[PDB]
Design a protein around this motif. Structure first.
Motif, PDB file in Angstrom:
ATOM      1  N   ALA A   1       0.827  -1.203   0.000  1.00 30.80           N
ATOM      2  CA  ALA A   1       0.000   0.000   0.000  1.00 30.80           C
ATOM      3  C   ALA A   1       0.864   1.256   0.000  1.00 30.80           C
ATOM      4  O   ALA A   1       2.072   1.188  -0.251  1.00 30.80           O
ATOM      5  CB  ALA A   1      -0.960   0.007   1.193  1.00 30.80           C
ATOM      6  N   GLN A   2       0.252   2.407   0.268  1.00 37.49           N
ATOM      7  CA  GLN A   2       0.977   3.672   0.272  1.00 37.49           C
ATOM      8  C   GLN A   2       0.242   4.639   1.185  1.00 37.49           C
ATOM      9  O   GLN A   2      -0.977   4.797   1.066  1.00 37.49           O
ATOM     10  CB  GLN A   2       1.090   4.245  -1.147  1.00 37.49           C
TER      11      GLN A   2
ATOM     12  N   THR B   1      -3.238   6.753   0.675  1.00 40.37           N
ATOM     13  CA  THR B   1      -4.128   6.140  -0.297  1.00 40.37           C
ATOM     14  C   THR B   1      -5.315   5.480   0.397  1.00 40.37           C
ATOM     15  O   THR B   1      -5.306   5.232   1.606  1.00 40.37           O
ATOM     16  CB  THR B   1      -3.377   5.110  -1.142  1.00 40.37           C
TER      17      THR B   1
ATOM     18  N   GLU C   1      -6.433   2.404  -0.088  1.00 44.01           N
ATOM     19  CA  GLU C   1      -6.113   1.043   0.327  1.00 44.01           C
ATOM     20  C   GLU C   1      -5.400   1.032   1.673  1.00 44.01           C
ATOM     21  O   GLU C   1      -5.723   0.217   2.543  1.00 44.01           O
ATOM     22  CB  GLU C   1      -5.276   0.343  -0.748  1.00 44.01           C
ATOM     23  N   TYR C   2      -4.447   1.944   1.873  1.00 47.68           N
ATOM     24  CA  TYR C   2      -3.778   2.041   3.166  1.00 47.68           C
ATOM     25  C   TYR C   2      -4.725   2.545   4.249  1.00 47.68           C
ATOM     26  O   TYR C   2      -4.612   2.134   5.410  1.00 47.68           O
ATOM     27  CB  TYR C   2      -2.558   2.956   3.055  1.00 47.68           C
TER      28      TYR C   2
ATOM     29  N   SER D   1      -6.852  -0.512   5.077  1.00 45.83           N
ATOM     30  CA  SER D   1      -6.053  -1.581   5.657  1.00 45.83           C
ATOM     31  C   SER D   1      -5.906  -1.395   7.160  1.00 45.83           C
ATOM     32  O   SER D   1      -5.771  -2.369   7.904  1.00 45.83           O
ATOM     33  CB  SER D   1      -4.684  -1.634   4.981  1.00 45.83           C
TER      34      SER D   1
END
Lengths: 51, 37
Positions: free
Chosen positions: A25-26, A29, A31-32, A35
């Motif tokens: 991930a990053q 973002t 997604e992060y 997460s």
């Protein structure tokens, strides 16, 4: 002998789920961001199991 | 001669548009075929 490649790609969605390479991930973002929610769920499940 | 050159230009543009439509249709066909898989 787990799930082989031949049976994986039979489902038409399997190939379209692998365009994104495995990543870490990053920060910043989506997604992060989500997460962290998944990790919180994992942590609470672990706490319940320990209890 | 002027009408003929105009007609040829229009025909070339029509063929280009038709081939773009053709490739788009083939792309959609391939996507639906993959969906049926």
């Amino acid at each position: 002998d787990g799930l082989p490649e031949k049976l994986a790609q039979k489902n038409p969605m399997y190939q379209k789920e692998r365009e994104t390479p495995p990543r870490f991930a990053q920060h910043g973002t989506f997604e992060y961001e989500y997460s962290q929610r998944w990790k919180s769920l994992d942590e609470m499940e672990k706490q319940q199991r320990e209890q | 001669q002027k009408r003929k050159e105009m007609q040829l230009r229009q025909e070339e543009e029509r063929r280009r548009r038709e081939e773009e439509m053709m490739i788009r249709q083939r792309e959609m066909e391939e996507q639906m075929r993959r969906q049926r898989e």
